[PDB]
Design a protein around this ligand. Structure first.
Ligand SMILES: CC(C)Cc1ccc([C@H](C)C(=O)O)cc1
Ligand SMILES: CC(C)Cc1ccc([C@H](C)C(=O)O)cc1
Length: 578
């Protein structure tokens, strides 16, 4: 029995949690009650297997079991139409079908949070259902959230309430902690979406290069054969979490943490604090540990990689291991480099060895490869310096606005909502990275852009409208940012023709938060630019200025939200004039 294997390892709590998250990520539209019901039924079954390891179907794989359970409500096409088909499938195909139907943008209603007085009551009255409800809302809206990690957020979420609801000012104690969690949750979800995308679209070889490079930066004192071992397990974990095998993902992740702690002295010195605390807190700790200090006397890479004469010979022998070694060596002494840059260099090396080793005199051909790295390191450096200077002048809001015009000009086909989301996030990278010293500025920025640009790529993959987006998303993972940076403005785009409804602002806007307000303007600026691509960064302002005048006035005037209808047609006339 497999269900039995996992149950024993994870226990009742975690087991139940993980299964709920899995079900939530599968049928995102299904209601809470139904998921709970299925989890229990499933958890009951599990219990019998622990005792009689062959009872009913205890001999099955989690796929068949999980699959059949969900298919007891999936067949209801009137609710989940396209799903029924999936249930008509079998074992492998049935599971792939489900994985294929996960929505990265579920049409679920926003998730507002009741007053502090209600949450605390609900929490205190029934603490279990409360927490379960949380896992459910998150899991269904983030179908790729790193499962083991969501259990850690669940614990911290519980501690927030467990303490604040006993305060003097609950609102003052809770709200902050919730905000900090809401964010970190999105960040966490984003990073994980990139990892799954990597494995799923580009293959495991790329996820490995990534793992080698980043682990090598954190553990410089570790030996290549040690890292490689770590890279192998780490890869197995995420492959599992990203395919939906959550229970085993949770298991393997635990084992890895165990190992890493035992062989502490062989790996890192800063692992001291991580191995002294609870499991969930230990895993989270390790995964977020600071790089160990760089080993004193280290020979130059040139020795074994560009000057030696056996280069091509060793390559041919075991190319992946040789490249793996190159990366490990280059990374361990370059934490001032972002993971994607390291992989870009590694790829420049591979391409050169491939060309150079088939020549009449290799050593002469591949002798100046490091000359080819100079541009690659410098390009990101200049880009960050220029954009951070701008960010430091305009501020976040205006800087996001600048990026909005820029992106809408590059990929006008893309849906207004998607562009607003991606442009806002891109702008948030300046608040995050620009404040650092040059030493930590590029790794921060470039690796973060890799997360944001992936968001666009997946959202776009749903309903493709721009071949320039498709191209820059599919041609090379590591080069996405460069590809997008090269795009200027789409010369083939044919301007949109005004639509009354799109530029009509209603009074229902005078009730929204300051945020949803600027987001309204931002959605207009985008619509504007789609109508007048050729327009310039000069004029737009003038109009955008006017846009504000409309809401302030029309909102503050006691005229029945009618100015909205009449003055709505007014602004349209001025614009067209410019
Ligand atoms: C990291 C951030 C602060 C600066 C930043 C943001 C987006 C871009 C892309 C390539 C663009 O401008 O299209 C470059 C630099
Ligand atoms: C293993 C490494 C040395 C070479 C390597 C690394 C990443 C990629 C991905 C798909 C890319 O090009 O974005 C290809 C080849």
């Amino acid at each position: 029995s497999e269900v039995a294997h996992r149950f024993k390892d994870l226990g009742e709590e975690n087991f139940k949690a993980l299964v709920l998250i899995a079900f939530a990520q599968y049928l995102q539209q299904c209601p809470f009650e139904d998921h709970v019901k299925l989890v229990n039924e499933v958890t009951e079954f599990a219990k019998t297997c622990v005792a009689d390891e062959s009872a009913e179907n205890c001999d099955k794989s989690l796929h068949t079991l999980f699959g059949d359970k969900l298919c007891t409500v999936a067949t209801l096409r009137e609710t989940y139409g396209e799903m029924a088909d999936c249930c008509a499938k079998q074992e492998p195909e049935r599971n792939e079908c489900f994985l294929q139907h996960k929505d990265d943008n579920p049409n679920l209603p926003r998730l507002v949070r009741p007053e502090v007085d209600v949450m605390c009551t609900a929490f205190h009255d029934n603490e279990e259902t409360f927490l379960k409800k949380y896992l459910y809302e998150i899991a269904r809206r983030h179908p790729y959230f790193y499962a083991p990690e969501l259990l850690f957020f669940a614990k911290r979420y519980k501690a927030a309430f467990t303490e604040c609801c006993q305060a003097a000012d609950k609102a003052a104690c809770l709200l902050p902690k919730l905000d900090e969690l809401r964010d970190e949750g999105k960040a966490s979800s984003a990073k994980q979406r990139l990892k799954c995308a990597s494995l799923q679209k580009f293959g495991e070889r790329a996820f490995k290069a990534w793992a080698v490079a980043r682990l090598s930066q954190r553990f410089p004192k570790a030996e290549f054969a040690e890292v490689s071992k770590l890279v192998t397990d780490l890869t197995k974990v995420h492959t599992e979490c990203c395919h939906g095998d959550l229970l085993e993902c949770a298991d393997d992740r635990a084992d890895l943490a165990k190992y890493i702690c035992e062989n502490q002295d062989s790996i890192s010195s800063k692992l001291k604090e991580c191995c002294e605390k609870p499991l969930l807190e230990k895993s989270h700790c390790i995964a977020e540990v600071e790089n160990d200090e760089m080993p004193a006397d280290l020979p130059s890479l040139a020795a074994d990689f560009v000057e030696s004469k056996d280069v091509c010979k060793n390559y041919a022998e075991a190319k992946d291991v040789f490249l793996g070694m190159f990366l490990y060596e280059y990374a361990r002494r370059h934490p001032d480099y972002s993971v994607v840059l390291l992989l870009r260099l590694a790829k420049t090396y591979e391409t050169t060895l491939e060309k150079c080793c088939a020549a009449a005199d290799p050593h002469e051909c591949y002798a100046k490869v490091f000359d080819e790295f100079k541009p690659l390191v410098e390009e990101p450096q200049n880009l960050i310096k220029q954009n951070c200077e701008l960010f430091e002048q305009l501020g976040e809001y205006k800087f996001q606005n600048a990026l909005l015009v820029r992106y809408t000009k590059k990929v006008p086909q893309v849906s207004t909502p998607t562009l607003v989301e991606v442009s806002r996030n891109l702008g948030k990278v300046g608040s995050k990275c620009c404040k650092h010293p040059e030493a930590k500025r590029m790794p921060c920025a470039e690796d973060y852009l890799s997360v944001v640009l992936n968001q666009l790529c997946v959202l776009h993959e749903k309903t493709p409208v721009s071949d320039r987006v498709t191209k820059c998303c599919t041609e090379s993972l590591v080069n996405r940012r460069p590809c997008f940076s090269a795009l200027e403005v789409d010369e083939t785009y044919v301007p949109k023709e005004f639509n009354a409804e799109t530029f009509t602002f209603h009074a229902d806007i005078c009730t929204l938060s300051e945020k949803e307000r600027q987001i309204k303007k931002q959605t207009a600026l985008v619509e504007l630019v789609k109508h007048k691509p050729k327009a310039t960064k000069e004029q737009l302002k003038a109009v955008m200025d006017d846009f504000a005048a409309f809401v302030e006035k029309c909102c503050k005037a006691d005229d029945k939200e009618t100015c909205f209808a009449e003055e709505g047609k007014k602004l349209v006339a001025a614009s067209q004039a410019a």
